[PDB]
Amino acid sequence: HLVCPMSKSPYVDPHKSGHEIWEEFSMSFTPAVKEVVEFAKRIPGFRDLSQHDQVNLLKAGTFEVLMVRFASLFDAKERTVTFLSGKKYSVDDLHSMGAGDLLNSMFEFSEKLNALQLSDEEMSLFTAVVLVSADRSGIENVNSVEALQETLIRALRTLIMKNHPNEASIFTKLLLKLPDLRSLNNMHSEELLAFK
Amino acid sequence: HLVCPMSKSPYVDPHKSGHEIWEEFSMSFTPAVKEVVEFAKRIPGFRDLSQHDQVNLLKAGTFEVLMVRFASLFDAKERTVTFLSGKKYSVDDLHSMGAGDLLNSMFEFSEKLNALQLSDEEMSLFTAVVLVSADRSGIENVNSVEALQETLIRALRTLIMKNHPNEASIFTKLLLKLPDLRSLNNMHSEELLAFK
Amino acid sequence: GLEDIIRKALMG
Amino acid sequence: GLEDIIRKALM
Ligand code: HEM
Ligand code: HEM
Structure with a gap:
């Protein structure tokens, strides 16, 4: 099976x-x-950024951007995952097909993210923060990436506190998604490389 | 060679x-x-917490706790690493012994953490936050772990707010260490296993 | 392979 | 490995 919702179906034609x-x-x-x-x-x-650093950030951060963008594929109330076909598959069914703790962790991530009730605008800025916060292990000019990150992070803090003036914790909760995303990326990358 | 500073020296008797x-x-x-x-x-x-979640948090988080605790082994100014014997080794010599991008990333992490000028009590509290923020994929009662993290994080936020100028920016920079640590952990584990 | 998709789309 | 150290230290 191919239990990744980027596929049209988890069923693989033998x-x-x-x-x-x-x-x-x-x-x-x-x-x-x-x-x-x-x-x-x-x-x-x-x-x-230099073209080398641009490609490295995208190499390391593409999955985490997509994880944020595709969080809505995880229906935390119904316990279903929408695959690219638009067809929904249940947690139980995917667990019979070999899906594991990673799938469950994607459900928890999407549930907590959806609960923050972000506007499209804050979600878009958060997603840029996610990309520019990618693993810097390849990066040649770390200072430029760190400077771009701080710029976007500062703008996100201002947008959040402007839009959620009495829910100050939202910004902290958003920052706490980055280690969670990074662990999703670490695990998912393992499962991906095992498939090939 | 064994170019991990948890060793007394990077040299291995053949x-x-x-x-x-x-x-x-x-x-x-x-x-x-x-x-x-x-x-x-x-x-x-x-x-x-359940014993299982205790063991799992520690399995996932011990490295990141130790990275924070031993960040001062990496002297970003003289570019030396202090091994367990107390002897210092240059980055050049360690790179010649097989160190690479991971070592460089640990110097960058240590430099940025030290720039925050945390006090001993703040550093301890941050260290607790790191441990209870460890990868949750193995956790069976994530709500209990989330509640521990929430409690410590607010305790850390008030501590930083009370003690630091530009507190919001210090606190943000402290939280951005968490995904950094998650990446260091992922790369280090791959090197650890490669050594066997 | 991911990197090839990325570089191709980045220069286009 | 790491787990056995941790488990024994936790008692
Ligand atoms: C270029 C992007 C991606 C590629 C090439 C990819 C590929 C894969 C592959 C090959 C697997 C292993 C399939 C199996 O063993 O059955 C997998 C697992 C998985 N992927 Fe992806 N994936 C990508 C992005 C994503 C995204 C963006 C999400 C979520 C929004 C996602 C969710 C999952 C899930 C839920 C699993 C199964 C997890 C489990 O075993 O518990 N993937 N992916
Ligand atoms: C129980 C905990 C740890 C174990 C078992 C462990 C083990 C190892 C092993 C076997 C290697 C590869 C050695 C080689 O290939 O030459 C390594 C690499 C390394 N470890 Fe550790 N380590 C631990 C904790 C730490 C901590 C806490 C730090 C930082 C304070 C650290 C820093 C490093 C560095 C800098 C390298 C070399 C990275 C590079 O190749 O660029 N280790 N570790």
């Missing part, structure tokens, strides 16, 4: 070679990756 | 078996692990 399964899968997830790159180009200051 | 090398290394790093566990037992509410 008559297909491994190379054919992955090419089909790549046709499904590539458009989401390309949308992350276009989003990155619209972040003020992102195009000013 | 006549020793991999088994003997590890048992000697384990004698060096085990006191530090046990002190993390003893630190965990002094966190209010920690021992009220």
Whole structure:
């Protein structure tokens, strides 16, 4: 099985070679990756990083951007995951197909994120913060990334406190999603590399 | 070579078996692990968690706690690392012995953490926050872990607000250490396993 | 392979 | 490995 909701279905046709399964899968997830790159180009200051650092941030942070953008695929009340086909699959069914604690952790992440009740605008700025906060292990000019991060983080703090003046904790709760996203990325990357 | 500063030295006797090398290394790093566990037992509410969640938080979080506690082994100014013997080693020599981007990332982390100029009590409280913020994927009662983290985080926020100029920015920078630590952990674990 | 998709989309 | 140290220290 292919229990990733980026696929059209978790069912894998056994008559297909491994190379054919992955090419089909790549046709499904590539458009989401390309949308992350276009989003990155619209972040003020992102195009000013060196091209090496731009690619490394996207390499390390694309999954976490998509995790934020696709949090709505996880219906925390019904316990279903919407795959790219639009068809919903239950937690129980995915657990029979081998999905595990990672899936459960994606449910908890999406539940807590949805509960913050962010506007589209704050969600968009949070997503830029998520991208520019990606693992800096490759990065050549860490100071420029750190400066871009602080700029976006400062703007997010101001937007949040402007829009949620008596719920000061929201900003802290948003910052606490970054280690959670990073752990989702660490685990997911393991499962991904095991598949191939 | 063994270029981890939990070792007494980066040098390995080539006549020793991999088994003997590890048992000697384990004698060096085990006191530090046990002190993390003893630190965990002094966190209010920690021992009220299920034993499984206690063990899981410590499995996931011990490295990140130790990274914070031993960040002052990395002297960002002279670019030396202090090994367990007390002897200091240059980044150049350690890179020649096989160190790489991970070491560089730990210097950057240590430099930024030290710039915050936390007091001893703040550093302890941050260390507790790090432990209870560890990867939750193995946790069976995530609500209980979330409530511990919430309690400590607010205690840390009020402490920073009371003691630091530009408190909101110090507190934000402290929380941004959490995903940084998560990445250091992920990379370090891969290096650890590669060494075997 | 992810990196190739990224670089291709980034320069376009 | 790490787990056994932790478990024994927790008692
Ligand atoms: C380029 C992006 C991605 C690629 C190439 C990818 C690929 C994969 C692969 C190959 C697996 C292993 C499938 C299996 O073993 O059955 C997997 C697991 C999974 N992925 Fe993705 N994925 C991507 C992004 C995402 C995103 C954005 C999400 C969520 C919004 C997601 C959710 C999941 C889940 C829930 C699982 C199963 C977790 C479990 O085992 O508990 N993936 N992914
Ligand atoms: C019980 C805890 C730990 C164990 C078992 C452990 C073990 C190891 C091992 C086996 C390696 C690879 C050695 C090599 O390939 O030469 C390594 C790498 C390393 N560890 Fe640890 N370590 C621990 C904790 C820590 C802590 C707390 C720090 C930081 C304060 C640290 C810093 C490093 C560094 C800097 C490297 C080399 C990174 C590079 O290659 O660039 N380790 N560790």
